[PDB]
Amino acid sequence: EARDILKRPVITEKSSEAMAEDKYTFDVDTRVNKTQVKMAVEEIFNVKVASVNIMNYKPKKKRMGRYQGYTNKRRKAIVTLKEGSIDLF
């Protein structure tokens, strides 16, 4: 369930400047609440989580050659931690 709650990390410039602090950004399953996210991070990465914020993103319109559609909707979570650090690249 823990490997199914967290989907992948987000690597952008806003997320990197946040990682300058102790904040890490994830894309998570669109059905979970922030308590599940908090407990999943602690189990997978073996750290101590201080807080967690979440937000929802709508689907966007997009084209590929006269084919109008939508992207997937997504859920984003930002995890502040007290002790430890997550190794990424």
Partner: protein, 67 residues
């Protein structure tokens, strides 16, 4: 791999599922950070997980008929 799986005891299968799920999680983290280069492993591990679950359901179905 379906014939190899059927030799495993029911408690080995659970441990194997638990390891394949972790191995698949790591690959999806590597793909997102942009350093994987071997994208064919993701489908392989998914299919192995599906086979393990199939063999696990077979035994649970079969024993209930005998019971």
């Amino acid at each position: 791999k379906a014939k190899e799986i059927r030799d495993l005891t029911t408690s080995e299968i659970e441990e194997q599922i638990k390891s394949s799920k972790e191995e698949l999680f790591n690959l999806r983290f590597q793909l997102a950070t942009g350093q994987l280069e071997e994208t064919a492993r993701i489908r392989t591990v998914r299919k192995t997980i599906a086979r393990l679950k199939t063999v696990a359901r077979e035994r649970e179905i079969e024993q209930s008929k005998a019971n």
